[PDB]
Ligand binder design. Structure first.
Ligand code: SF4
Lengths: 232, 49, 109, 49, 32, 50, 109, 109, 109, 109, 32, 32
């Protein structure tokens, strides 16, 4: 069971109910963009729908195919949003196809919606009632002048992952440079072609033994030297 | 008509009631999938428990 | 936005169908709820006849808006100004008069 | 450990097979009636399964 | 509506078959 | 190992039935793993719900 | 629950389709049994004629309920009060009168 | 089982279609055989008119049977008592009389 | 390019269906915009009546162009010369006259 | 090849639809070209009435050709001999005269 | 009857594809 | 046009599925 609030359950039980609103939020902070809020309808006063303080904007967007099943493959829902005016194109050329960002979906009954929306106000307004679920954009299946279609996926997907993941190599270091495991923090020394330099912008390790010797960090070398003698 | 021992507070009209006989055995189940549908309904699949 | 000036011949058909979400349970019980926040929008169906010389003006007016721009019009049914858009229209050219038949959808935009 | 990894709405959860108590009861009035006229459809396992 | 409907349904069936095979090949499916 | 085999044998001997049905507008509460009870009047033959 | 106080015109059509479970393969032995308790729910096809001024009140009454809310109405056919819902209605505006067509569906809730 | 007492207006339509198994060979030769052991069943389509006061009795009679129970009736076509079931019916409520239209299928059960 | 010189009969039907791009899911926010430059192209449903002797000339004129070639024609609707193509036409032969029915579609090329 | 002798009553319908290969580009531009080398072929629809005694002769003539052989005939529309074939036909037998209905497709073979 | 028929046919095609794959998996089929 | 259309579409879907599997079986396909 999801820990749904009691008033939402009471609303679900009743025979005659209020409108069900889905409030889409597309988050591009991890990729490097801004977070965008969309909703399918305007409110009763012809203004953007106001939930808490967010004020989601009106825009034709639909998401279908959501499911909760662990027996077979992953779920892979689908989200369709229109770009007649070229917004999705502007986001995709810039933020590299909107691949990797988060999509958050909220389902709130219109009974609990904020009092700003209705012309006569709402006496039952309660901002705590919503049902939230998070997904991650996976691909842009289509992009046209009429619409654009994305396919979402679960944040925890196991398509390209292999467990042990760490390879024993004879001549190449697998660590990340200046990371936790390499443990190097000092002046810029060399380039990625083992050419001396001092600018901090173009300092990169070549993952070679000479590249590591430039740092005098041979102790933390990722690879295991002289294996190829035994493997032979 | 029945005559219950006590009437819980605020039992509105058109609310679900179940009769639990001692003879009959419960038929439990365990959900395995809940497919959200466009009409606003949910399809639920279960396996015996 | 420009306004529709010409008058409508009697026989206008106002068809309104709301959108609802229905679930039908076992013994006739059910759940009903509105689908959207906004109220429903009507679809006025009109017929109007104009002289041959004035047909060009009306045809050009409907042509310039295409099927994507909306214009103000005060239907005789309720006498309140609304925003309507005409996606398609037709005309039958007689000897003296031209008769237009078109369906004005209502849009909140 | 006989648990099925299912992605809940917000977090990845593991559902194990241990005895549990009921949650909700669904009678013939709570569930949707298809055009066929059968609210519940039961199926069984195969002989060789 | 004549054999043209049958041809269209056959084409749609083939497309669905390719889609289903590709869906099954990924992790957790029958072919994996 | 013996319990691992016995679990398969017992779960495939005891639990051999599945059900499929649709529940409208109040399925927000359910997630996989929930245990529910089915009171089917036609199956039992006596009126148990309303 | 509001009530419907307007008067219908001759020709009201009552269509009843009882819900029944029947199994029959080919021309074989056939078995029939009811689907539930409230098997028979009638849908009433009504027509209303009201003047130009009074059309707004009826239109507002039908629009305010939408397709979801149910009102009380006592049909002229059997004279027993029932709860109905109007999911669609069409108006045909004339010079002096307006003619309404609608379908009322009996509901248990 | 109860008996249908009310009378039928002229214009009854009796439609009887047998079920057969046909195989069409090459040059117009063929195989024909009856599908089942039992004889075919007709589908009488009747219409009848009753006053306003007596409409409720007939509607209640057809209602209590639902679409699953069969009642005896002697069609004027052949004057032999048979078993019929009315799956659906409709009525047009005029000012003085109500006109029913229904299809009585014949069942051997 | 050859021209059409015959005269049409009362009752020409000019059908206009502009090409537009609209996106709307359910009842939500709707967006519309034109599809191209020459969005609106009309099809004229004409009717011609010619004697028995002059039916051959009109039939030959419509046949030699086929459905591909386009000819100039000045519609009586707006009196501006356009390029049209006739893709289908049917003739109803009478004792002294022949009646033609065809659809001319405006084209850009 | 045998020639058709019997005469056709007024009301003959001549339907001709050419075959073209069309491609529609973005802004109303297009490509049009004929599909085949040969010119299109009309499909005359005729109606003729003959006495009861002469009906057998015409029926035998049309039955002899089946639906695969062609006979020469000079339509009143253009007065040039062509090759036609009748795939299907029907006749309505009155007290004194029989009226036939058939569609003579034109075939170049 | 519009795109709805196409969508329904697509769903039925996918169901048929799953059923056919499961049928072919067992003994004697292509995948066995 | 009733359930008969559904049954016919299902049969055509199964035929398409078999054809697609056999097509993908040969060289260059997914199953190769
Ligand atoms: S080669 Fe040495 S300095 Fe470079 S990443 Fe590996 S451990 Fe760090």
């Amino acid at each position: 069971m999801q820990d749904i609030r009691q008033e939402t359950l009471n609303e679900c039980t009743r025979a005659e109910q209020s409108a069900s609103v889905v409030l889409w939020e597309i988050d591009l902070t991890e990729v490097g963009g801004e977070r965008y809020f969309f909703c399918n309808e305007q409110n009763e006063k012809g203004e953007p729908v106001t939930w808490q303080g967010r004020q989601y904007q009106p825009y034709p967007i639909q998401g279908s195919g959501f499911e909760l099943n662990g027996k077979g493959t992953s779920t892979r829902p689908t989200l369709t949003v229109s770009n007649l005016y070229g917004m999705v194109t502007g986001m995709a050329e810039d933020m590299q196809s909107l691949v990797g960002g988060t999509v958050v979906r909220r389902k709130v009954y219109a009974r609990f919606l904020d009092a700003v929306n209705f012309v006569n106000g709402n006496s039952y307004a309660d901002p705590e009632q919503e049902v939230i679920s998070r997904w991650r954009i996976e691909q842009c299946s289509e992009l046209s002048a009429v619409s654009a279609s994305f396919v979402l996926s679960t944040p925890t997907e196991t398509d390209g992952a292999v467990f042990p993941g760490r390879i024993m190599l004879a001549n190449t270091c697998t660590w990340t440079y200046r990371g936790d495991e390499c443990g190097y923090s000092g002046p810029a020394v060399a380039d990625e072609y083992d050419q001396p330099t001092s600018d901090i912008t173009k300092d990169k390790c070549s993952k070679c033994l000479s590249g590591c010797k430039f740092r005098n960090n041979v102790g933390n070398f990722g690879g295991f030297l002289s294996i190829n003698k035994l493997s032979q | 008509k029945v005559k219950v021992s006590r009437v819980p507070d605020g039992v509105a009209e058109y609310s679900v009631w179940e009769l639990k006989l001692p003879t009959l055995r419960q038929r439990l189940f365990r959900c395995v999938s809940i497919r959200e549908n466009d009409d606003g309904t949910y399809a639920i699949t279960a396996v015996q428990h | 936005m420009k306004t529709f000036r010409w008058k409508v011949k009697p026989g206008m058909d106002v068809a309104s169908v709301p959108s609802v979400r229905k679930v039908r349970f076992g013994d006739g019980y059910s759940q009903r709820a509105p689908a959207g926040l906004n109220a429903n929008l009507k679809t006025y169906s009109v017929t109007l006849s104009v002289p041959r010389e004035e047909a060009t003006v009306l045809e050009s007016f409907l042509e310039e808006h295409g099927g994507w721009k909306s214009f103000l019009w005060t239907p005789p049914y309720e006498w309140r100004q609304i925003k309507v858009t005409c996606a398609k229209w037709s005309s039958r050219v007689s000897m003296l008069r031209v008769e237009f038949s078109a369906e004005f959808e209502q849009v909140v935009n | 450990m006989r648990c099925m990894p299912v992605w809940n709405g917000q977090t990845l959860t593991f559902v194990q097979d241990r005895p549990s108590d009921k949650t909700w009861t669904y009678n013939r009035s709570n569930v949707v009636m298809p055009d066929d006229g059968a609210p519940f459809r039961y199926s069984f396992s195969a002989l060789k399964d | 509506i004549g054999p043209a409907a049958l041809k269209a349904v056959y084409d749609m069936a083939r497309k669905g078959a390719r889609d289903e095979i590709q869906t099954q090949m990924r992790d957790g499916g029958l072919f994996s | 190992a013996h319990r691992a085999g016995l679990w398969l044998i017992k779960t495939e001997l005891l639990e051999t039935q599945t059900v499929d049905f649709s529940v409208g507008a109040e399925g927000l509460r359910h997630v996989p793993g929930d245990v529910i009870e089915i009171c089917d009047d036609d199956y039992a033959g006596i009126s148990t719900g309303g």
